Design a protein around this ligand. Structure first.
Ligand SMILES: [Mg+2]
Ligand SMILES: [Mg+2]
Ligand SMILES: [Mg+2]
Ligand SMILES: [Mg+2]
Ligand SMILES: [Mg+2]
Ligand SMILES: [Mg+2]
Ligand SMILES: [Mg+2]
Ligand SMILES: [Mg+2]
Ligand SMILES: [Mg+2]
Ligand SMILES: [Mg+2]
Ligand SMILES: [Mg+2]
Ligand SMILES: [Mg+2]
Ligand SMILES: [Mg+2]
Ligand SMILES: [Mg+2]
Ligand SMILES: [Mg+2]
Ligand SMILES: [Mg+2]
Ligand SMILES: [Mg+2]
Ligand SMILES: [Mg+2]
Lengths: 155, 73, 115
RNA sequence: GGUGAAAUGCGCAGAUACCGGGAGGAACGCCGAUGGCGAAGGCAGCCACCUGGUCCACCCGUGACGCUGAGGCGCGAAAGCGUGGGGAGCAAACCGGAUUAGAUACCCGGGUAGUCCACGCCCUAAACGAUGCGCGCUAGGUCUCUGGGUCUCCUGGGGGCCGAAGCUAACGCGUUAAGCGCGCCGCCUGGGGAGUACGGCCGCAAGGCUGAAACUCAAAGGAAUUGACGGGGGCCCGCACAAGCGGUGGA
Protein backbone atom coordinates (compact mmCIF):
# COMPACT_ATOMS: atom_id res chain seq x y z
CA UNK A 1 0.00 0.00 0.00
CA UNK A 2 0.74 3.72 -0.27
CA UNK A 3 -2.46 4.93 -1.81
CA UNK A 4 -4.85 3.28 0.69
CA UNK A 5 -5.45 0.03 2.57
CA UNK A 6 -6.54 -2.92 0.53
CA UNK A 7 -10.02 -4.28 0.83
CA UNK A 8 -9.37 -7.87 1.80
CA UNK A 9 -10.08 -10.79 -0.55
CA UNK A 10 -13.78 -11.73 -0.42
CA UNK A 11 -13.65 -15.53 -0.57
CA UNK A 12 -16.16 -18.12 -1.79
CA UNK A 13 -17.90 -19.42 1.32
CA UNK A 14 -17.32 -23.16 1.82
CA UNK A 15 -19.13 -25.43 -0.67
CA UNK A 16 -20.01 -28.13 1.91
CA UNK A 17 -20.34 -26.58 5.37
CA UNK A 18 -20.41 -22.86 4.53
CA UNK A 19 -17.87 -21.08 6.71
CA UNK A 20 -15.70 -18.46 5.00
CA UNK A 21 -13.00 -19.57 7.44
CA UNK A 22 -13.18 -23.10 5.99
CA UNK A 23 -12.41 -21.62 2.64
CA UNK A 24 -9.29 -19.67 3.62
CA UNK A 25 -7.99 -22.76 5.37
CA UNK A 26 -8.41 -24.96 2.26
CA UNK A 27 -6.47 -22.42 0.21
CA UNK A 28 -4.01 -22.19 3.10
CA UNK A 29 -3.44 -25.92 2.84
CA UNK A 30 -3.22 -25.79 -0.93
CA UNK A 31 0.08 -25.55 -2.71
CA UNK A 32 0.63 -24.60 -6.34
CA UNK A 33 -3.08 -24.04 -6.83
CA UNK A 34 -3.76 -27.82 -6.72
CA UNK A 35 -7.04 -27.05 -4.93
CA UNK A 36 -8.94 -30.29 -5.59
CA UNK A 37 -6.33 -31.96 -3.49
CA UNK A 38 -6.55 -29.67 -0.43
CA UNK A 39 -10.34 -29.94 -0.54
CA UNK A 40 -9.99 -33.71 -0.03
CA UNK A 41 -7.19 -33.12 2.49
CA UNK A 42 -9.82 -31.14 4.39
CA UNK A 43 -12.81 -33.35 3.95
CA UNK A 44 -10.93 -36.45 5.12
CA UNK A 45 -9.84 -34.62 8.25
CA UNK A 46 -13.56 -34.28 8.98
CA UNK A 47 -14.04 -38.03 8.54
CA UNK A 48 -11.22 -38.67 11.05
CA UNK A 49 -12.28 -36.00 13.56
CA UNK A 50 -16.01 -36.80 13.48
CA UNK A 51 -14.99 -40.40 14.15
CA UNK A 52 -12.01 -40.15 16.56
CA UNK A 53 -13.55 -37.65 19.00
CA UNK A 54 -17.15 -38.00 17.81
CA UNK A 55 -18.56 -34.53 17.81
CA UNK A 56 -18.94 -31.93 15.08
CA UNK A 57 -15.61 -31.68 13.22
CA UNK A 58 -16.67 -28.13 12.22
CA UNK A 59 -16.94 -26.91 15.84
CA UNK A 60 -13.35 -28.12 16.60
CA UNK A 61 -12.03 -26.08 13.75
CA UNK A 62 -13.61 -22.87 15.12
CA UNK A 63 -12.00 -23.72 18.48
CA UNK A 64 -8.69 -25.03 17.05
CA UNK A 65 -8.42 -21.45 15.68
CA UNK A 66 -9.39 -19.34 18.71
CA UNK A 67 -6.62 -21.24 20.51
CA UNK A 68 -3.71 -20.35 18.22
CA UNK A 69 -4.88 -16.77 17.54
CA UNK A 70 -2.25 -14.54 19.21
CA UNK A 71 -3.33 -11.27 20.90
CA UNK A 72 0.01 -9.44 21.18
CA UNK A 73 3.01 -9.49 18.81
CA UNK A 74 6.50 -8.05 18.30
CA UNK A 75 6.01 -5.22 15.76
CA UNK A 76 9.78 -4.38 15.65
CA UNK A 77 11.17 -0.83 15.07
CA UNK A 78 14.09 1.63 15.43
CA UNK A 79 14.98 4.92 17.20
CA UNK A 80 18.02 6.47 15.52
CA UNK A 81 21.03 4.58 16.91
CA UNK A 82 19.82 1.04 17.53
CA UNK A 83 16.55 -0.84 17.04
CA UNK A 84 14.12 -2.37 19.54
CA UNK A 85 11.92 -5.44 19.29
CA UNK A 86 8.59 -3.98 20.41
CA UNK A 87 5.27 -5.17 21.91
CA UNK A 88 2.16 -4.47 19.86
CA UNK A 89 -1.48 -5.58 19.94
CA UNK A 90 -3.03 -7.41 16.92
CA UNK A 91 -5.71 -6.84 14.20
CA UNK A 92 -8.91 -8.96 13.89
CA UNK A 93 -7.96 -10.54 10.57
CA UNK A 94 -4.21 -10.89 11.33
CA UNK A 95 -5.24 -13.52 13.80
CA UNK A 96 -7.26 -15.51 11.25
CA UNK A 97 -4.22 -15.93 8.99
CA UNK A 98 -1.49 -16.75 11.50
CA UNK A 99 -4.07 -19.07 13.02
CA UNK A 100 -4.49 -21.16 9.88
CA UNK A 101 -0.93 -20.47 8.77
CA UNK A 102 0.48 -22.02 11.90
CA UNK A 103 -2.14 -24.82 12.02
CA UNK A 104 -0.84 -25.99 8.69
CA UNK A 105 2.87 -25.22 9.31
CA UNK A 106 2.68 -27.59 12.26
CA UNK A 107 0.78 -30.28 10.40
CA UNK A 108 3.64 -30.47 7.88
CA UNK A 109 6.09 -30.48 10.81
CA UNK A 110 4.05 -33.36 12.27
CA UNK A 111 5.68 -36.78 11.90
CA UNK A 112 2.80 -38.95 10.58
CA UNK A 113 2.86 -40.50 7.08
CA UNK A 114 -0.51 -39.13 5.84
CA UNK A 115 -1.92 -35.75 4.65
CA UNK A 116 -5.39 -35.27 6.15
CA UNK A 117 -4.05 -37.16 9.14
CA UNK A 118 -1.55 -34.53 10.24
CA UNK A 119 -4.38 -32.05 9.85
CA UNK A 120 -6.79 -34.13 11.92
CA UNK A 121 -4.35 -34.51 14.83
CA UNK A 122 -3.07 -30.94 14.67
CA UNK A 123 -6.79 -29.99 14.79
CA UNK A 124 -7.59 -31.86 18.00
CA UNK A 125 -4.09 -31.03 19.34
CA UNK A 126 -4.70 -27.36 18.53
CA UNK A 127 -8.14 -27.35 20.25
CA UNK A 128 -6.60 -29.02 23.33
CA UNK A 129 -3.79 -26.64 24.17
CA UNK A 130 -0.74 -28.65 23.13
CA UNK A 131 0.87 -29.44 19.76
CA UNK A 132 3.15 -27.07 17.82
CA UNK A 133 0.13 -24.88 16.96
CA UNK A 134 -0.63 -23.34 20.33
CA UNK A 135 3.07 -23.59 21.48
CA UNK A 136 4.01 -20.76 19.10
CA UNK A 137 0.89 -18.70 19.97
CA UNK A 138 1.88 -18.75 23.64
CA UNK A 139 5.41 -18.10 22.38
CA UNK A 140 4.79 -14.64 20.86
CA UNK A 141 2.66 -13.66 23.85
CA UNK A 142 5.74 -14.78 25.79
CA UNK A 143 8.00 -12.57 23.68
CA UNK A 144 5.27 -9.99 24.18
CA UNK A 145 5.95 -10.09 27.93
CA UNK A 146 9.61 -11.20 28.40
CA UNK A 147 10.29 -8.17 26.17
CA UNK A 148 7.80 -5.75 27.73
CA UNK A 149 10.84 -3.68 28.69
CA UNK A 150 10.17 -1.22 25.84
CA UNK A 151 6.38 -0.79 25.69
CA UNK A 152 6.86 2.97 25.28
CA UNK A 153 8.30 2.60 21.76
CA UNK A 154 5.07 0.82 20.70
CA UNK A 155 3.01 2.16 17.75
CA UNK B 1 -5.88 30.76 25.52
CA UNK B 2 -4.78 31.30 29.19
CA UNK B 3 -8.00 33.38 29.30
CA UNK B 4 -8.94 32.77 32.93
CA UNK B 5 -8.81 36.15 34.68
CA UNK B 6 -5.84 38.43 35.27
CA UNK B 7 -5.34 39.64 38.87
CA UNK B 8 -5.68 43.37 37.98
CA UNK B 9 -9.49 43.12 37.89
CA UNK B 10 -9.83 40.59 40.76
CA UNK B 11 -9.35 43.34 43.39
CA UNK B 12 -10.24 46.84 44.44
CA UNK B 13 -7.42 49.36 44.36
CA UNK B 14 -4.11 48.97 46.17
CA UNK B 15 -0.48 50.13 46.37
CA UNK B 16 2.30 48.21 44.63
CA UNK B 17 4.86 49.34 47.16
CA UNK B 18 3.22 48.22 50.48
CA UNK B 19 5.33 45.09 50.90
CA UNK B 20 3.34 43.45 53.68
CA UNK B 21 -0.09 43.57 51.93
CA UNK B 22 0.23 39.75 51.72
CA UNK B 23 -3.51 39.15 51.24
CA UNK B 24 -3.12 40.57 47.74
CA UNK B 25 0.53 39.71 47.02
CA UNK B 26 -0.29 35.97 47.36
CA UNK B 27 -2.37 36.24 44.20
CA UNK B 28 0.66 37.53 42.38
CA UNK B 29 2.51 34.30 42.97
CA UNK B 30 1.80 30.84 41.58
CA UNK B 31 1.72 27.29 42.84
CA UNK B 32 5.43 28.15 43.01
CA UNK B 33 6.81 31.29 44.64
CA UNK B 34 7.47 32.58 41.13
CA UNK B 35 6.30 36.14 40.31
CA UNK B 36 3.47 35.67 37.84
CA UNK B 37 4.34 36.13 34.15
CA UNK B 38 3.15 39.58 33.02
CA UNK B 39 0.36 37.92 30.96
CA UNK B 40 -1.15 36.37 34.05
CA UNK B 41 -1.02 39.58 36.08
CA UNK B 42 -1.97 42.10 33.40
CA UNK B 43 0.26 44.74 34.84
CA UNK B 44 1.72 47.74 33.01
CA UNK B 45 5.26 48.34 31.76
CA UNK B 46 5.96 50.27 34.98
CA UNK B 47 3.65 48.30 37.18
CA UNK B 48 5.28 44.84 36.99
CA UNK B 49 8.78 46.43 37.21
CA UNK B 50 7.51 47.74 40.55
CA UNK B 51 5.70 44.56 41.71
CA UNK B 52 9.10 43.01 40.98
CA UNK B 53 11.17 44.77 43.59
CA UNK B 54 8.10 44.45 45.86
CA UNK B 55 7.83 40.66 46.19
CA UNK B 56 11.64 40.75 46.26
CA UNK B 57 11.19 42.90 49.38
CA UNK B 58 8.28 41.01 50.99
CA UNK B 59 10.35 37.86 50.67
CA UNK B 60 13.38 38.80 52.75
CA UNK B 61 10.84 39.73 55.47
CA UNK B 62 9.61 36.16 55.35
CA UNK B 63 5.97 37.09 54.55
CA UNK B 64 5.95 35.90 50.88
CA UNK B 65 7.61 32.56 49.98
CA UNK B 66 10.69 32.10 47.90
CA UNK B 67 9.42 28.88 46.29
CA UNK B 68 6.99 26.06 47.04
CA UNK B 69 6.89 22.35 46.19
CA UNK B 70 3.91 20.97 44.16
CA UNK B 71 0.28 19.88 44.64
CA UNK B 72 -0.64 17.42 42.00
CA UNK B 73 -4.22 18.74 41.93
CA UNK C 1 11.68 -5.11 62.53
CA UNK C 2 9.17 -2.44 63.75
CA UNK C 3 5.75 -1.53 62.34
CA UNK C 4 4.71 1.80 60.71
CA UNK C 5 1.27 3.05 59.62
CA UNK C 6 1.84 6.24 57.64
CA UNK C 7 5.06 6.54 55.64
CA UNK C 8 6.28 8.81 52.83
CA UNK C 9 7.54 7.82 49.37
CA UNK C 10 10.63 9.41 47.86
CA UNK C 11 11.14 9.03 44.06
CA UNK C 12 14.39 10.06 42.33
CA UNK C 13 14.10 9.81 38.53
CA UNK C 14 17.36 10.32 36.62
CA UNK C 15 18.03 9.05 33.13
CA UNK C 16 20.48 6.22 33.85
CA UNK C 17 18.25 5.16 36.76
CA UNK C 18 15.12 5.78 38.85
CA UNK C 19 15.32 5.44 42.68
CA UNK C 20 12.62 4.95 45.32
CA UNK C 21 13.55 5.35 49.01
CA UNK C 22 10.49 5.06 51.22
CA UNK C 23 10.42 6.53 54.77
CA UNK C 24 8.42 7.57 57.85
CA UNK C 25 6.73 11.03 58.49
CA UNK C 26 10.18 12.39 59.50
CA UNK C 27 12.06 11.25 56.47
CA UNK C 28 13.77 8.18 57.81
CA UNK C 29 14.86 5.46 55.33
CA UNK C 30 12.72 2.43 56.00
CA UNK C 31 13.42 0.64 52.71
CA UNK C 32 15.07 1.93 49.54
CA UNK C 33 15.35 0.55 45.99
CA UNK C 34 16.32 1.53 42.44
CA UNK C 35 16.34 -0.29 39.12
CA UNK C 36 19.93 -1.37 39.51
CA UNK C 37 18.94 -3.42 42.50
CA UNK C 38 16.10 -5.15 40.57
CA UNK C 39 18.64 -6.84 38.27
CA UNK C 40 19.24 -4.17 35.66
CA UNK C 41 22.86 -3.68 34.71
CA UNK C 42 23.61 -0.70 32.44
CA UNK C 43 21.38 1.44 30.23
CA UNK C 44 18.77 -1.15 31.10
CA UNK C 45 18.24 0.63 34.39
CA UNK C 46 16.56 3.84 33.21
CA UNK C 47 13.64 2.26 31.39
CA UNK C 48 10.10 3.16 32.53
CA UNK C 49 9.72 -0.55 33.21
CA UNK C 50 12.56 -0.28 35.70
CA UNK C 51 10.91 2.67 37.47
CA UNK C 52 7.71 0.59 37.60
CA UNK C 53 9.88 -2.18 39.15
CA UNK C 54 11.79 -0.28 41.84
CA UNK C 55 8.45 1.18 43.00
CA UNK C 56 7.45 -2.44 43.52
CA UNK C 57 10.44 -4.12 45.16
CA UNK C 58 10.79 -1.04 47.38
CA UNK C 59 7.08 -0.90 48.16
CA UNK C 60 7.23 -4.67 48.81
CA UNK C 61 10.05 -4.43 51.37
CA UNK C 62 7.80 -1.72 52.90
CA UNK C 63 4.62 -3.80 53.36
CA UNK C 64 7.01 -6.30 54.97
CA UNK C 65 7.03 -3.72 57.76
CA UNK C 66 3.26 -3.36 57.37
CA UNK C 67 2.85 -0.19 55.32
CA UNK C 68 -0.60 1.37 55.19
CA UNK C 69 -0.56 4.90 53.81
CA UNK C 70 1.88 6.80 51.59
CA UNK C 71 2.46 10.38 50.58
CA UNK C 72 4.65 10.73 47.49
CA UNK C 73 7.51 13.03 46.70
CA UNK C 74 9.38 13.03 43.36
CA UNK C 75 12.80 14.41 42.49
CA UNK C 76 13.42 15.09 38.78
CA UNK C 77 12.18 14.69 35.23
CA UNK C 78 13.35 11.27 34.19
CA UNK C 79 12.51 8.11 32.34
CA UNK C 80 9.28 6.70 33.75
CA UNK C 81 9.10 9.43 36.33
CA UNK C 82 5.38 9.07 36.80
CA UNK C 83 5.57 5.41 35.78
CA UNK C 84 6.67 4.71 39.31
CA UNK C 85 4.08 7.08 40.75
CA UNK C 86 1.50 4.94 39.04
CA UNK C 87 3.50 1.81 40.05
CA UNK C 88 2.63 2.72 43.67
CA UNK C 89 -1.11 3.33 43.26
CA UNK C 90 -0.89 -0.07 41.59
CA UNK C 91 0.96 -1.89 44.39
CA UNK C 92 -1.71 -1.71 47.09
CA UNK C 93 -0.95 1.46 48.98
CA UNK C 94 -3.13 4.48 49.67
CA UNK C 95 -1.49 7.34 47.81
CA UNK C 96 -2.07 10.40 50.03
CA UNK C 97 -0.62 13.47 48.42
CA UNK C 98 1.78 13.72 45.44
CA UNK C 99 4.47 16.40 45.33
CA UNK C 100 7.30 17.49 43.04
CA UNK C 101 10.34 19.28 44.44
CA UNK C 102 13.11 19.31 41.89
CA UNK C 103 16.54 20.80 42.71
CA UNK C 104 16.27 24.24 41.11
CA UNK C 105 19.18 26.66 41.43
CA UNK C 106 18.63 30.42 41.36
CA UNK C 107 21.72 30.30 39.24
CA UNK C 108 24.76 29.47 41.30
CA UNK C 109 26.90 26.76 39.79
CA UNK C 110 28.17 26.80 36.16
CA UNK C 111 27.01 23.39 34.88
CA UNK C 112 29.55 21.14 33.16
CA UNK C 113 30.38 21.55 29.41
CA UNK C 114 27.59 19.10 28.69
CA UNK C 115 24.95 21.66 29.79
C1' G D 1 27.38 6.94 38.22
C1' G D 2 28.13 7.34 33.09
C1' U D 3 27.04 6.25 27.58
C1' G D 4 25.05 5.56 21.16
C1' A D 5 26.51 1.10 24.07
C1' A D 6 30.41 0.47 27.93
C1' A D 7 34.59 0.58 31.15
C1' U D 8 38.08 3.61 34.02
C1' G D 9 35.63 6.10 39.05
C1' C D 10 33.01 6.10 43.89
C1' G D 11 30.53 1.92 47.89
C1' C D 12 30.33 -3.49 53.06
C1' A D 13 36.30 1.66 56.67
C1' G D 14 28.80 1.74 54.62
C1' A D 15 28.30 4.89 48.66
C1' U D 16 23.51 6.71 46.07
C1' A D 17 18.66 7.89 47.55
C1' C D 18 16.87 9.88 52.59
C1' C D 19 16.04 13.62 57.27
C1' G D 20 18.55 17.63 60.79
C1' G D 21 22.55 20.71 61.80
C1' G D 22 27.20 23.18 60.15
C1' A D 23 31.05 25.66 57.06
C1' G D 24 32.66 27.72 52.55
C1' G D 25 32.89 29.74 47.52
C1' A D 26 30.40 31.27 43.16
C1' A D 27 26.84 33.24 40.71
C1' C D 28 21.36 35.48 41.01
C1' G D 29 15.76 31.30 39.29
C1' C D 30 10.38 33.34 38.39
C1' C D 31 9.58 39.15 37.31
C1' G D 32 12.71 38.89 31.94
C1' A D 33 9.86 41.31 27.46
C1' U D 34 10.92 41.91 19.81
C1' G D 35 11.77 45.78 27.13
C1' G D 36 15.87 49.82 29.87
C1' C D 37 20.41 52.47 30.45
C1' G D 38 25.23 53.71 29.06
C1' A D 39 30.32 56.61 24.70
C1' A D 40 32.17 52.23 24.03
C1' G D 41 33.79 47.67 25.94
C1' G D 42 29.60 46.68 29.36
C1' C D 43 25.18 46.30 33.36
C1' A D 44 20.01 42.71 36.19
C1' G D 45 18.62 38.85 43.61
C1' C D 46 17.41 42.72 47.96
C1' C D 47 19.11 47.79 51.08
C1' A D 48 21.36 52.34 51.86
C1' C D 49 24.90 55.67 50.74
C1' C D 50 28.52 58.69 47.14
C1' U D 51 27.52 59.99 41.91
C1' G D 52 27.27 60.34 36.05
C1' G D 53 24.10 60.85 31.77
C1' U D 54 19.32 61.81 30.15
C1' C D 55 14.06 63.19 28.83
C1' C D 56 9.53 65.87 29.66
C1' A D 57 7.10 71.03 31.44
C1' C D 58 6.95 76.59 32.15
C1' C D 59 9.98 79.63 28.33
C1' C D 60 12.44 82.85 33.34
C1' G D 61 18.07 83.89 32.61
C1' U D 62 23.00 85.42 30.06
C1' G D 63 23.36 86.33 24.22
C1' A D 64 26.64 82.85 19.17
C1' C D 65 29.47 81.55 24.18
C1' G D 66 28.53 76.95 18.88
C1' C D 67 30.92 71.87 15.46
C1' U D 68 35.05 68.67 14.79
C1' G D 69 39.19 67.35 16.38
C1' A D 70 46.12 65.55 14.07
C1' G D 71 49.17 64.62 18.39
C1' G D 72 48.63 64.45 23.95
C1' C D 73 45.25 62.37 28.25
C1' G D 74 41.70 58.91 30.14
C1' C D 75 38.12 54.51 29.90
C1' G D 76 38.57 49.35 27.21
C1' A D 77 35.05 42.20 27.51
C1' A D 78 37.81 37.84 27.34
C1' A D 79 42.12 35.24 27.98
C1' G D 80 47.72 36.69 29.95
C1' C D 81 51.44 38.30 33.43
C1' G D 82 52.95 40.34 38.78
C1' U D 83 52.72 40.40 44.76
C1' G D 84 49.19 38.75 48.20
C1' G D 85 44.68 36.58 49.57
C1' G D 86 40.41 32.96 47.90
C1' G D 87 39.32 28.01 45.56
C1' A D 88 32.55 25.53 45.93
C1' G D 89 31.36 24.51 40.80
C1' C D 90 33.45 24.94 35.78
C1' A D 91 37.75 23.87 33.64
C1' A D 92 43.34 24.56 28.69
C1' A D 93 47.58 21.68 30.01
C1' C D 94 47.73 16.91 32.13
C1' C D 95 46.03 11.32 34.13
C1' G D 96 42.77 7.37 32.64
C1' G D 97 38.53 4.70 30.15
C1' A D 98 35.84 4.14 25.61
C1' U D 99 35.02 4.79 20.23
C1' U D 100 38.00 4.28 15.44
C1' A D 101 42.06 1.35 10.72
C1' G D 102 44.73 5.03 13.98
C1' A D 103 41.87 9.49 17.80
C1' U D 104 47.27 13.59 20.74
C1' A D 105 39.90 14.71 19.38
C1' C D 106 33.80 14.46 19.25
C1' C D 107 31.66 11.01 24.07
C1' C D 108 32.91 9.54 29.72
C1' G D 109 35.58 9.63 35.17
C1' G D 110 39.44 12.84 37.86
C1' G D 111 42.78 17.08 37.28
C1' U D 112 46.78 22.33 37.97
C1' A D 113 46.38 27.21 35.58
C1' G D 114 42.55 29.94 35.84
C1' U D 115 37.94 32.19 36.33
C1' C D 116 36.49 35.12 42.30
C1' C D 117 38.84 40.02 45.63
C1' A D 118 42.50 43.32 45.82
C1' C D 119 46.17 46.57 44.07
C1' G D 120 49.32 47.78 39.93
C1' C D 121 50.45 46.04 34.59
C1' C D 122 48.52 43.93 29.59
C1' C D 123 45.46 47.95 25.97
C1' U D 124 43.94 43.30 21.65
C1' A D 125 38.75 41.41 19.30
C1' A D 126 33.78 39.30 14.01
C1' A D 127 35.54 45.91 20.24
C1' C D 128 29.94 44.81 14.98
C1' G D 129 24.64 48.74 12.94
C1' A D 130 31.10 45.26 10.39
C1' U D 131 27.40 52.25 8.99
C1' G D 132 33.14 58.26 13.00
C1' C D 133 30.73 63.00 14.91
C1' G D 134 27.18 67.35 15.03
C1' C D 135 23.11 70.42 12.46
C1' G D 136 19.11 71.61 8.46
C1' C D 137 15.26 68.97 4.75
C1' U D 138 12.11 64.74 2.69
C1' A D 139 4.58 60.47 2.42
C1' G D 140 3.25 57.85 6.13
C1' G D 141 1.46 53.11 8.72
C1' U D 142 1.45 49.99 12.88
C1' C D 143 3.94 48.20 17.25
C1' U D 144 6.59 49.03 21.80
C1' C D 145 9.23 51.99 26.48
C1' U D 146 9.24 56.83 28.59
C1' G D 147 7.87 61.84 29.66
C1' G D 148 3.90 66.72 29.16
C1' G D 149 -1.33 68.60 27.56
C1' U D 150 -7.86 71.30 27.02
C1' C D 151 -5.55 63.06 28.17
C1' U D 152 -12.23 59.92 22.15
C1' C D 153 -6.87 62.16 20.82
C1' C D 154 -2.76 66.12 20.56
C1' U D 155 2.51 66.65 21.05
C1' G D 156 8.12 65.61 22.90
C1' G D 157 12.46 61.40 23.45
C1' G D 158 13.58 56.16 22.57
C1' G D 159 13.77 51.31 20.72
C1' G D 160 11.71 47.76 16.56
C1' C D 161 9.01 46.02 11.97
C1' C D 162 6.51 47.47 6.85
C1' G D 163 6.49 50.92 3.27
C1' A D 164 6.45 57.37 -0.51
C1' A D 165 9.97 60.02 -2.78
C1' G D 166 14.75 59.11 -3.71
C1' C D 167 19.69 56.01 -3.39
C1' U D 168 21.89 51.36 -4.61
C1' A D 169 25.95 46.80 -8.28
C1' A D 170 22.38 43.86 -6.11
C1' C D 171 20.99 42.61 -1.25
C1' G D 172 18.63 45.76 0.97
C1' C D 173 18.42 51.44 3.24
C1' G D 174 14.37 53.72 4.12
C1' U D 175 12.47 60.73 9.36
C1' U D 176 17.09 55.42 14.08
C1' A D 177 19.14 56.97 5.92
C1' A D 178 22.62 53.38 2.94
C1' G D 179 17.50 59.75 0.75
C1' C D 180 18.77 65.55 -0.39
C1' G D 181 22.91 69.35 1.15
C1' C D 182 27.00 72.20 4.92
C1' G D 183 31.57 71.55 8.34
C1' C D 184 35.63 68.50 10.28
C1' C D 185 37.99 63.77 11.20
C1' G D 186 40.28 59.34 10.18
C1' C D 187 40.64 55.59 6.44
C1' C D 188 41.10 52.95 1.20
C1' U D 189 44.19 52.57 -3.91
C1' G D 190 44.64 44.76 -7.25
C1' G D 191 45.37 38.91 -4.65
C1' G D 192 49.39 36.21 -2.71
C1' G D 193 53.70 37.06 0.12
C1' A D 194 51.81 39.74 5.33
C1' G D 195 49.86 41.69 9.66
C1' U D 196 56.16 38.91 8.28
C1' A D 197 60.99 41.53 7.62
C1' C D 198 63.71 46.40 8.73
C1' G D 199 63.61 50.49 12.10
C1' G D 200 61.86 53.12 15.96
C1' C D 201 57.95 53.00 20.33
C1' C D 202 55.41 50.82 24.42
C1' G D 203 55.62 46.18 28.40
C1' C D 204 58.55 42.59 33.51
C1' A D 205 57.27 38.99 29.99
C1' A D 206 53.89 36.74 26.63
C1' G D 207 53.50 40.74 22.87
C1' G D 208 51.58 45.11 20.90
C1' C D 209 51.72 49.69 17.83
C1' U D 210 53.51 51.96 13.45
C1' G D 211 54.34 48.98 8.98
C1' A D 212 57.41 47.70 3.75
C1' A D 213 59.81 45.49 -0.39
C1' A D 214 62.03 41.73 -3.78
C1' C D 215 59.53 37.83 -6.40
C1' U D 216 55.18 35.18 -8.20
C1' C D 217 49.80 34.82 -10.23
C1' A D 218 45.55 37.20 -13.97
C1' A D 219 43.34 37.40 -10.69
C1' A D 220 41.33 38.08 -5.30
C1' G D 221 36.41 39.95 -4.58
C1' G D 222 30.85 41.68 -4.08
C1' A D 223 26.06 40.94 -4.10
C1' A D 224 22.45 37.85 -7.60
C1' U D 225 20.37 33.60 -11.39
C1' U D 226 19.49 28.48 -13.18
C1' G D 227 20.71 24.23 -11.81
C1' A D 228 23.28 20.27 -9.47
C1' C D 229 24.05 18.59 -4.31
C1' G D 230 23.29 17.88 1.76
C1' G D 231 24.79 12.40 6.77
C1' G D 232 18.29 20.22 5.64
C1' G D 233 13.68 20.21 6.13
C1' G D 234 8.08 20.12 4.10
C1' C D 235 4.43 17.26 0.60
C1' C D 236 3.32 12.85 -3.09
C1' C D 237 4.53 7.64 -6.13
C1' G D 238 6.91 2.55 -7.95
C1' C D 239 6.18 -4.80 -5.36
C1' A D 240 11.15 0.95 -3.21
C1' C D 241 10.63 -1.49 2.24
C1' A D 242 7.29 -3.74 5.14
C1' A D 243 2.54 -7.60 5.41
C1' G D 244 2.40 -12.78 2.13
C1' C D 245 3.95 -16.87 -1.76
C1' G D 246 8.37 -19.19 -4.17
C1' G D 247 13.46 -19.41 -5.38
C1' U D 248 18.75 -18.57 -6.36
C1' G D 249 23.39 -18.75 -3.60
C1' G D 250 24.84 -25.34 -1.72
C1' A D 251 23.89 -30.26 -5.17
MG1 LIG E 1 21.47 20.23 54.15
MG1 LIG F 1 27.50 44.72 23.10
MG1 LIG G 1 13.45 84.09 27.64
MG1 LIG H 1 18.82 90.97 26.75
MG1 LIG I 1 34.91 66.37 20.43
MG1 LIG J 1 40.50 39.11 33.13
MG1 LIG K 1 47.69 33.57 44.11
MG1 LIG L 1 36.99 16.05 30.92
MG1 LIG M 1 46.35 35.89 38.76
MG1 LIG N 1 42.34 43.63 38.57
MG1 LIG O 1 42.33 44.79 29.43
MG1 LIG P 1 46.22 43.06 15.69
MG1 LIG Q 1 31.94 52.96 15.74
MG1 LIG R 1 10.09 56.64 17.02
MG1 LIG S 1 10.80 52.56 -4.81
MG1 LIG T 1 12.13 48.69 5.93
MG1 LIG U 1 51.29 43.85 -4.71
MG1 LIG V 1 10.01 -9.13 1.43
Amino acid sequence: ARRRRAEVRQLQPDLVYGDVLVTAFINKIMRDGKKNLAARIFYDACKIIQEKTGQEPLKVFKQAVENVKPRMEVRSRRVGGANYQVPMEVSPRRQQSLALRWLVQAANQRPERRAAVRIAHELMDAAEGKGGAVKKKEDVERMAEANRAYAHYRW
Amino acid sequence: PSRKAKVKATLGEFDLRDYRNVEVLKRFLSETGKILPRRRTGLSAKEQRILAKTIKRARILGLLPFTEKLVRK
Amino acid sequence: KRQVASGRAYIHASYNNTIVTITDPDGNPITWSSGGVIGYKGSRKGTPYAAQLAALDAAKKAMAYGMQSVDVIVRGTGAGREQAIRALQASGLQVKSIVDDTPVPHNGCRPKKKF
